[PDB]
Amino acid sequence: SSLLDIIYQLRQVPRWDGSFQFEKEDVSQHSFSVIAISHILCELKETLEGKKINKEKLLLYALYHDVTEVVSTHIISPVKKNSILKDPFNAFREQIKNSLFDNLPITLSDTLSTILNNNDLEIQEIVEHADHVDAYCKSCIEVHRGNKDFISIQRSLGDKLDNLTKEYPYLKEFQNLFLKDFPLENKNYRY
Amino acid sequence: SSLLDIIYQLRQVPRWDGSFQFEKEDVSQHSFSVIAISHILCELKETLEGKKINKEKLLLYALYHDVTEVVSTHIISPVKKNSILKDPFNAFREQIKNSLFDNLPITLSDTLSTILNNNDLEIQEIVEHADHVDAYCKSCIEVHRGNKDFISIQRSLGDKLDNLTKEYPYLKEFQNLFLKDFPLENKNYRY
Ligand SMILES: Nc1ncnc2c1ncn2[C@@H]1O[C@H](COP(=O)(O)OP(=O)(O)O)[C@H]1CO
Ligand SMILES: Nc1ncnc2c1ncn2[C@@H]1O[C@H](COP(=O)(O)OP(=O)(O)O)[C@H]1CO
Ligand SMILES: [Mg+2]
Ligand SMILES: [Mg+2]
Ligand SMILES: [Mg+2]
Ligand SMILES: [Mg+2]
Structure with missing residues (x-):
């Protein structure tokens, strides 16, 4: 099986192509942050909207939400959202899904296929929002580092948020809980 | 709350201090891999040992299993396992747990405290094994890159495994499924 290799190979997939970054970001770091953000959003949504979400499926979907970028690489959204490329890239993403996990036990094979082809619309929407939050947060950190090239990126992500x-x-x-002073200038929790 | 800041601050915590690495590893990349390994081990264990594990709690425990290293930094195991430091570092780790998450909703506050102070022994053991697997895998990748300095590291991790x-x-x-040809020289899944 290629599954373990793929998990580590996501470190070789960079994000933010074509933008100067003080800190280079890979899909594994991004996915870690998306899992944690997805968890926090889920807890807030459960309490406000009066429900219980299946967090196993949510967290596993967040975990693998960008696993196909080990084949497609990470195509930035100004490119992927172009009307010329929108549908073809989703079709391409779908082709990668139907091919990735081959030499597994049916316990893994079925469970992996279930996660990738998840049709729970609410879990997909939570992870999509977490994905936008993470992009905003990255842009906040870069601006905080002094990266003027992310100011306009932060502004459009902030406007959409x-x-x-x-x-x-x-x-x-x-x-209100996290995104008003981010990142913290004083990491008081270290001391 | 410092919780979102801490999630991104884990990128500033390096692993493998004192060893030459061709690729520098941070706690967020490591934790992403541990979450995925913990999931795979859980599926295998469920099928072989005839049970169902609560994957929500397992994945959340894996997600935050090293979050206290945002305060303690990452102390390598040859140092942390010294008889002089063994118990004090666990006591220190416990002090960080009881202090980290302050300005939260009780939904988050209680849920975060539950995750950190988890007393499910089996979930802790799965993540501990995933943690060892990830260390072995890192050592395999470094050796594969040509890093002779990780050969003895790979050997002791492999012997313990x-x-x-x-x-x-x-x-x-x-x-048997993943760790016999790792990493793959031919990433056929990309093509
Ligand atoms: N303004 C931007 N300029 C350049 N790259 C961007 C921008 N915004 C996002 N990116 C990169 O595209 C990746 C994902 O962005 P997104 O998730 O916010 O947008 P959607 O794909 O959901 O539409 C992100 C990092 O590479
Ligand atoms: N042989 C080694 N030489 C140097 N650093 C090591 C070694 N083995 C592990 N490390 C680093 O200690 C971190 C965690 O190691 P571990 O999880 O396998 O050991 P335990 O803490 O569980 O006892 C690891 C990367 O920094
Ligand atoms: Mg997105
Ligand atoms: Mg994503
Ligand atoms: Mg360990
Ligand atoms: Mg660990």
């Missing part, structure tokens, strides 16, 4: 908070109250709550 | 496979059949199965 603001609009999402008007429609998803759990995102507004997340914004 | 071999002994663990004699006592935990799900680890032997994992070894």
Whole structure:
């Protein structure tokens, strides 16, 4: 099976192609952050919208949400969202899904296929929001480092986030708890 | 709350201090790999040992299993396992747990405390094994890159892994599925 190799190979997939970064980011670091953000958003959403989400499936979906970029590489959204490329890249992403996991036990094989082809719309939407939050946070850290080239990136991500908070109250709550002073200049928790 | 800041601050915590690495590894990359390994080990263990594990708690424990290293930094095991430092570092790790998460909702606060102070012994043991597997895998990748300085590291980690496979059949199965040709020289799945 290639599955363990793929998990480590995600470190070789860079994000933010074409932008100067003070800190280079790979898909594994991004996915770690998306898992944690997805968990936090889930807890907030459960309490506000009065429900219980299946966190096993949510966390596993977040964990593997970008695993196909080991084949496609990471195509930045200004490129992937172009009308010329939008549908073909989703079709390509779908082709990678249907091919990735071959030499496994049916316990793993079925469970891996279930995760990749997940049709739980709410879990997909939570991870999509977590994905946007993480992109915003990265842009905040770069700006904080002094990277003027991410100012316009932070602004458009922040504008899209603001609009999402008007429609998803759990995102507004997340914004209020964490995204108003981010990152922290004083990491008091270290001392 | 410092929780979101801490999630990103784990990128500033390096592993393998005092060893030459061709690729520098941080706690976020390591934790991503441990989450995925913990999931795979859990599926194998469930099938072999005839049970169902609560994967929500397992994955969340793996996710945060090294979060206290944002305060302690990452102390390598030859140092932390010295008889002089063994108990004090665990006491220190415990002090960090009881202090980390302050300004949260009780939904988050209680859930975060539950995860950190988890007393499910089996979940702790799965993550401990995943942690050893990840260390072995890192050592395999470095050796594969040509890093002769990790040969003796790979050997001792491999020896400890071999002994663990004699006592935990799900680890032997994992070894048979993934750890016999690792990493792959031919990443055929990319093409
Ligand atoms: N303004 C931007 N300029 C350049 N790259 C960007 C920008 N915004 C995002 N990226 C990169 O595309 C990746 C994912 O972005 P996203 O998740 O926020 O957008 P969607 O794919 O969800 O539409 C992100 C890092 O490479
Ligand atoms: N032989 C070694 N030489 C130097 N550093 C090591 C070695 N083995 C492990 N490390 C580093 O200690 C970290 C964790 O190791 P571990 O998880 O396998 O050992 P335990 O803490 O579980 O006893 C690891 C990377 O920094
Ligand atoms: Mg996105
Ligand atoms: Mg993503
Ligand atoms: Mg360990
Ligand atoms: Mg660890």
